[PDB]
Scaffold this motif. Sequence first.
Motif, PDB file in Angstrom:
ATOM      1  N   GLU A  96      -3.466  -5.213  31.737  1.00 52.16           N
ATOM      2  CA  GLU A  96      -4.334  -4.982  30.597  1.00 52.16           C
ATOM      3  C   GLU A  96      -5.141  -6.241  30.263  1.00 52.16           C
ATOM      4  O   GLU A  96      -4.588  -7.260  29.860  1.00 52.16           O
ATOM      5  CB  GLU A  96      -3.494  -4.529  29.392  1.00 52.16           C
ATOM      6  CG  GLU A  96      -4.229  -4.476  28.050  1.00 52.16           C
ATOM      7  CD  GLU A  96      -3.277  -4.335  26.851  1.00 52.16           C
ATOM      8  OE1 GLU A  96      -2.048  -4.496  27.033  1.00 52.16           O
ATOM      9  OE2 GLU A  96      -3.759  -4.062  25.725  1.00 52.16           O
ATOM     10  N   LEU A  97      -6.453  -6.163  30.430  1.00 52.88           N
ATOM     11  CA  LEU A  97      -7.337  -7.262  30.058  1.00 52.88           C
ATOM     12  C   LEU A  97      -7.397  -7.400  28.546  1.00 52.88           C
ATOM     13  O   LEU A  97      -7.282  -6.402  27.820  1.00 52.88           O
ATOM     14  CB  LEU A  97      -8.744  -7.027  30.608  1.00 52.88           C
ATOM     15  CG  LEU A  97      -8.846  -6.720  32.100  1.00 52.88           C
ATOM     16  CD1 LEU A  97     -10.262  -6.348  32.438  1.00 52.88           C
ATOM     17  CD2 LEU A  97      -8.373  -7.904  32.940  1.00 52.88           C
ATOM     18  N   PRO A  98      -7.560  -8.645  28.065  1.00 51.60           N
ATOM     19  CA  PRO A  98      -7.610  -8.909  26.625  1.00 51.60           C
ATOM     20  C   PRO A  98      -8.634  -8.026  25.920  1.00 51.60           C
ATOM     21  O   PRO A  98      -9.721  -7.750  26.446  1.00 51.60           O
ATOM     22  CB  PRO A  98      -7.986 -10.402  26.535  1.00 51.60           C
ATOM     23  CG  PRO A  98      -8.254 -10.866  27.944  1.00 51.60           C
ATOM     24  CD  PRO A  98      -7.591  -9.886  28.864  1.00 51.60           C
ATOM     25  N   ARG A  99      -8.244  -7.554  24.743  1.00 50.73           N
ATOM     26  CA  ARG A  99      -9.050  -6.663  23.927  1.00 50.73           C
ATOM     27  C   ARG A  99     -10.369  -7.321  23.560  1.00 50.73           C
ATOM     28  O   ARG A  99     -10.381  -8.436  23.052  1.00 50.73           O
ATOM     29  CB  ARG A  99      -8.280  -6.387  22.640  1.00 50.73           C
ATOM     30  CG  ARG A  99      -8.547  -5.079  21.972  1.00 50.73           C
ATOM     31  CD  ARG A  99      -7.610  -4.945  20.775  1.00 50.73           C
ATOM     32  NE  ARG A  99      -7.202  -3.564  20.529  1.00 50.73           N
ATOM     33  CZ  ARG A  99      -6.646  -3.139  19.395  1.00 50.73           C
ATOM     34  NH1 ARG A  99      -6.431  -3.989  18.394  1.00 50.73           N
ATOM     35  NH2 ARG A  99      -6.311  -1.860  19.255  1.00 50.73           N
ATOM     36  N   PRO A 100     -11.491  -6.636  23.798  1.00 47.39           N
ATOM     37  CA  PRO A 100     -12.778  -7.177  23.342  1.00 47.39           C
ATOM     38  C   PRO A 100     -13.009  -6.928  21.848  1.00 47.39           C
ATOM     39  O   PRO A 100     -12.252  -6.230  21.193  1.00 47.39           O
ATOM     40  CB  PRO A 100     -13.789  -6.350  24.133  1.00 47.39           C
ATOM     41  CG  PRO A 100     -13.115  -5.006  24.264  1.00 47.39           C
ATOM     42  CD  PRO A 100     -11.648  -5.345  24.495  1.00 47.39           C
ATOM     43  N   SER A 101     -14.086  -7.470  21.319  1.00 44.74           N
ATOM     44  CA  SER A 101     -14.418  -7.273  19.919  1.00 44.74           C
ATOM     45  C   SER A 101     -15.822  -6.695  19.799  1.00 44.74           C
ATOM     46  O   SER A 101     -16.745  -7.146  20.472  1.00 44.74           O
ATOM     47  CB  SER A 101     -14.342  -8.602  19.166  1.00 44.74           C
ATOM     48  OG  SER A 101     -15.099  -9.585  19.851  1.00 44.74           O
ATOM     49  N   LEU A 102     -15.984  -5.698  18.937  1.00 45.90           N
ATOM     50  CA  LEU A 102     -17.285  -5.077  18.763  1.00 45.90           C
ATOM     51  C   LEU A 102     -17.818  -5.507  17.414  1.00 45.90           C
ATOM     52  O   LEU A 102     -17.184  -5.261  16.381  1.00 45.90           O
ATOM     53  CB  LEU A 102     -17.160  -3.559  18.796  1.00 45.90           C
ATOM     54  CG  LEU A 102     -18.480  -2.797  18.836  1.00 45.90           C
ATOM     55  CD1 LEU A 102     -19.383  -3.281  19.957  1.00 45.90           C
ATOM     56  CD2 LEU A 102     -18.198  -1.289  18.957  1.00 45.90           C
ATOM     57  N   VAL A 103     -18.979  -6.150  17.428  1.00 45.76           N
ATOM     58  CA  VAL A 103     -19.534  -6.700  16.209  1.00 45.76           C
ATOM     59  C   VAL A 103     -20.977  -6.279  16.067  1.00 45.76           C
ATOM     60  O   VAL A 103     -21.628  -5.927  17.065  1.00 45.76           O
ATOM     61  CB  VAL A 103     -19.447  -8.242  16.213  1.00 45.76           C
ATOM     62  CG1 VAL A 103     -17.995  -8.692  16.404  1.00 45.76           C
ATOM     63  CG2 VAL A 103     -20.313  -8.820  17.311  1.00 45.76           C
ATOM     64  N   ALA A 166     -13.407  -1.356  42.281  1.00 52.99           N
ATOM     65  CA  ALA A 166     -12.038  -0.912  42.477  1.00 52.99           C
ATOM     66  C   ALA A 166     -11.239  -1.969  43.248  1.00 52.99           C
ATOM     67  O   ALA A 166     -11.819  -2.778  43.970  1.00 52.99           O
ATOM     68  CB  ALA A 166     -12.028   0.422  43.206  1.00 52.99           C
ATOM     69  N   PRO A 167      -9.908  -2.005  43.053  1.00 53.98           N
ATOM     70  CA  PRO A 167      -9.196  -1.237  42.029  1.00 53.98           C
ATOM     71  C   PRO A 167      -9.454  -1.845  40.669  1.00 53.98           C
ATOM     72  O   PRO A 167      -9.562  -3.067  40.516  1.00 53.98           O
ATOM     73  CB  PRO A 167      -7.728  -1.406  42.415  1.00 53.98           C
ATOM     74  CG  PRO A 167      -7.681  -2.684  43.148  1.00 53.98           C
ATOM     75  CD  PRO A 167      -8.980  -2.780  43.894  1.00 53.98           C
ATOM     76  N   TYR A 168      -9.568  -0.977  39.679  1.00 54.18           N
ATOM     77  CA  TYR A 168      -9.993  -1.397  38.367  1.00 54.18           C
ATOM     78  C   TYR A 168      -8.881  -2.048  37.567  1.00 54.18           C
ATOM     79  O   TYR A 168      -7.732  -1.614  37.608  1.00 54.18           O
ATOM     80  CB  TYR A 168     -10.531  -0.191  37.620  1.00 54.18           C
ATOM     81  CG  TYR A 168     -11.777   0.368  38.243  1.00 54.18           C
ATOM     82  CD1 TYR A 168     -12.928  -0.411  38.359  1.00 54.18           C
ATOM     83  CD2 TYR A 168     -11.812   1.676  38.718  1.00 54.18           C
ATOM     84  CE1 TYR A 168     -14.077   0.101  38.916  1.00 54.18           C
ATOM     85  CE2 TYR A 168     -12.953   2.187  39.286  1.00 54.18           C
ATOM     86  CZ  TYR A 168     -14.081   1.405  39.372  1.00 54.18           C
ATOM     87  OH  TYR A 168     -15.221   1.932  39.933  1.00 54.18           O
ATOM     88  N   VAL A 169      -9.237  -3.105  36.847  1.00 55.52           N
ATOM     89  CA  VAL A 169      -8.382  -3.650  35.800  1.00 55.52           C
ATOM     90  C   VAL A 169      -9.088  -3.393  34.460  1.00 55.52           C
ATOM     91  O   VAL A 169     -10.243  -3.799  34.263  1.00 55.52           O
ATOM     92  CB  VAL A 169      -8.144  -5.157  35.972  1.00 55.52           C
ATOM     93  CG1 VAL A 169      -6.918  -5.565  35.185  1.00 55.52           C
ATOM     94  CG2 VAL A 169      -7.988  -5.513  37.450  1.00 55.52           C
ATOM     95  N   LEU A 170      -8.406  -2.703  33.554  1.00 54.86           N
ATOM     96  CA  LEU A 170      -9.047  -2.225  32.342  1.00 54.86           C
ATOM     97  C   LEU A 170      -8.599  -3.023  31.127  1.00 54.86           C
ATOM     98  O   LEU A 170      -7.425  -3.400  31.034  1.00 54.86           O
ATOM     99  CB  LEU A 170      -8.688  -0.762  32.114  1.00 54.86           C
ATOM    100  CG  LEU A 170      -9.486   0.358  32.782  1.00 54.86           C
ATOM    101  CD1 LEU A 170      -9.614   0.143  34.266  1.00 54.86           C
ATOM    102  CD2 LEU A 170      -8.818   1.708  32.484  1.00 54.86           C
ATOM    103  N   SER A 171      -9.526  -3.283  30.199  1.00 54.98           N
ATOM    104  CA  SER A 171      -9.138  -3.861  28.927  1.00 54.98           C
ATOM    105  C   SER A 171      -8.674  -2.743  28.005  1.00 54.98           C
ATOM    106  O   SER A 171      -8.835  -1.555  28.309  1.00 54.98           O
ATOM    107  CB  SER A 171     -10.300  -4.588  28.266  1.00 54.98           C
ATOM    108  OG  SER A 171     -10.967  -3.728  27.360  1.00 54.98           O
TER     109      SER A 171
END
Length: 179
Positions: A96-103, A166-171
Amino acid sequence: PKPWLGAQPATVVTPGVNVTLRCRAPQPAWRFGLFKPGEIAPLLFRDVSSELAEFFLEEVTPAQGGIYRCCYRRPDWGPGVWSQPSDVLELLVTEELPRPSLVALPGANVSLRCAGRLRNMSFVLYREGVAAPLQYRHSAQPWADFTLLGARAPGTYSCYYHTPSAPYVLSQRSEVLVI
């Protein structure tokens, strides 16, 4: 003169895959060492007689992640003399990639930025109530900017990002941003 240290297949990977770390010196050397922060002796080393040394990391776990530097050594050098270190190479092994932030951005058209902490990623924007990705953008910089036109602006939004191939790593999904 410092060596160079690079990773294949990538610098961000899922646990289980194989990684090759390659250290290229700018002149022929005897011993190549991979060093982690806080430990003075090299974590791993190879005695090759080459400009190049390769360290095969098998089925990687987060133990294989972290900051790496490479240093090399010629035998005719004094006791405990290594070269200048390569620039760091940090390997991220994670499911799990670190959570992004939506601003919300300054500014009819509203602009949102989805900012994560990794370069060269694919970013995807969602609006709650809509099942398919609202927008999507590949960015070199660790963010994407998405624009909302007039009466479409209002809503509850979230984004995430993933590795561009691929292969995908998803946040994980950002917290929601209400507009």
